[PDB]
Amino acid sequence: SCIQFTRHASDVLLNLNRLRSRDILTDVVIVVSREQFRAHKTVLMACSGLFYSIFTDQLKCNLSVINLDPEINPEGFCILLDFMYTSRLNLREGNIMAVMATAMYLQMEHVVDTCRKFIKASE
Amino acid sequence: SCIQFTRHASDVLLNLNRLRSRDILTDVVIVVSREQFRAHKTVLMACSGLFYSIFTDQLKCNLSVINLDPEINPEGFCILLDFMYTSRLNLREGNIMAVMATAMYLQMEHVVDTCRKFIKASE
Amino acid sequence: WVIP
Amino acid sequence: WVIP
Numbered sequence: 001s002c003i004q005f006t007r008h009a010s011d012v013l014l015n016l017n018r019l020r021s022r023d024i025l026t027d028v029v030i031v032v033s034r035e036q037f038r039a040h041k042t043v044l045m046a047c048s049g050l051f052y053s054i055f056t057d058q059l060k061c062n063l064s065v066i067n068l069d070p071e072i073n074p075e076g077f078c079i080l081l082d083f084m085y086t087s088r089l090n091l092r093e094g095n096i097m098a099v100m101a102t103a104m105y106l107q108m109e110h111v112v113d114t115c116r117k118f119i120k121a122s123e
Numbered sequence: 124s125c126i127q128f129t130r131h132a133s134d135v136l137l138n139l140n141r142l143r144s145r146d147i148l149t150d151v152v153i154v155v156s157r158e159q160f161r162a163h164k165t166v167l168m169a170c171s172g173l174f175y176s177i178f179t180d181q182l183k184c185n186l187s188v189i190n191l192d193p194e195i196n197p198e199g200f201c202i203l204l205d206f207m208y209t210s211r212l213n214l215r216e217g218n219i220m221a222v223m224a225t226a227m228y229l230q231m232e233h234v235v236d237t238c239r240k241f242i243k244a245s246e
Numbered sequence: 247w248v249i250p
Numbered sequence: 251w252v253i254p
């Protein structure tokens with residue numbers, strides 16, 4: 001018999017992004033080819049199968065720095081981190097291959113799906 | 124020129140609630156008349172003007188335990204904590220006064236608004 | 247607010 | 251996915 005507030009999830013995500021932009025309560029640095037990205041472990045876990053596996057590990061859950069595979073493109077990661085905190089994906093002809101490869105590595109199934117669809121349309 | 128994934132914010136909140144239910148990466152205990160509630164500081168801040176003010180304070184941001192005012196009803200808090208993580212509010216004739224009072228104290232404006240409206244309809 |  |  002609950003009532004539901006339609007905009008609540010979007011408002012929560014908007015506030016989490018405001019905290020990220022002001023570097024409030026960020027608890028991890030993600031290192032991508034020497035580029036550094038500060039974030040909240042819980043948000044990373046909520047969006048990515050890879051971060052979910054990492055931060056549920058009894059040793060890695062306590063790390064303040066995570067280094068990604070050197071093949072990962074920092075721009076592709078940045079676009080995906082922005083998507084995690086906003087639901088908005090900056091998908092462009094020039095970045096789609098790097099974004100799809102990064103989403104496959106991060107295990108972000110819905111992003112992989114739209115990249116596959118956009119690539120298929122261009123062939 | 125971004126594309127947007129409609130269900131992303133809801134999916135993020137659903138995963139944050141899954142972490143809460145399994146007590147994963149919870150970093151604070153909220154004490155309400157001896158009842159204890161584990162949660163994520165970022166989610167509490169994203170939903171409540173009171174928690175936002177508390178955890179942006181340079182001393183309180185580091186506390187692992189927060190004690191609420193003794194007038195706060197634990198059931199009212201529990202219903203609001205559930206709403207924070209799900210967008211669903213269990214509003215009932217028997218709890219509406221405690222829920223509204225707790226939402227006013229927590230500074231959850233949209234919850235206060237619907238409680239005021241539901242009370243006005245019954246008079 | 248809605249009935250979910 | 252939509253055009254926001």
Ligand SMILES: CSc1ncc(Cl)c(Nc2ccc3c(c2)CC(=O)N3)n1
Binds near residue numbers: 048050
């Ligand atoms: C599976 S239960 C669960 N519980 C809590 C969290 Cl934080 C979580 N996250 C997560 C797991 C897998 C995947 C994603 C997020 C995005 C994606 O495409 N795959 N999962």
Ligand SMILES: CSc1ncc(Cl)c(Nc2ccc3c(c2)CC(=O)N3)n1
Binds near residue numbers: 018169172175231232
């Ligand atoms: C105001 S900027 C901002 N930036 C980040 C966060 Cl985490 C935040 N939360 C917050 C503040 C006030 C209120 C709520 C959340 C719910 C409500 O009714 N009032 N606010």
Ligand SMILES: [Cl-]
Binds near residue numbers: 062063064065
């Ligand atoms: Cl470390």
Ligand SMILES: [Cl-]
Binds near residue numbers: 047108109110111112
């Ligand atoms: Cl995704």
Ligand SMILES: [Cl-]
Binds near residue numbers: 185186187188
């Ligand atoms: Cl403490």
Ligand SMILES: [Cl-]
Binds near residue numbers: 170233235
């Ligand atoms: Cl609210």
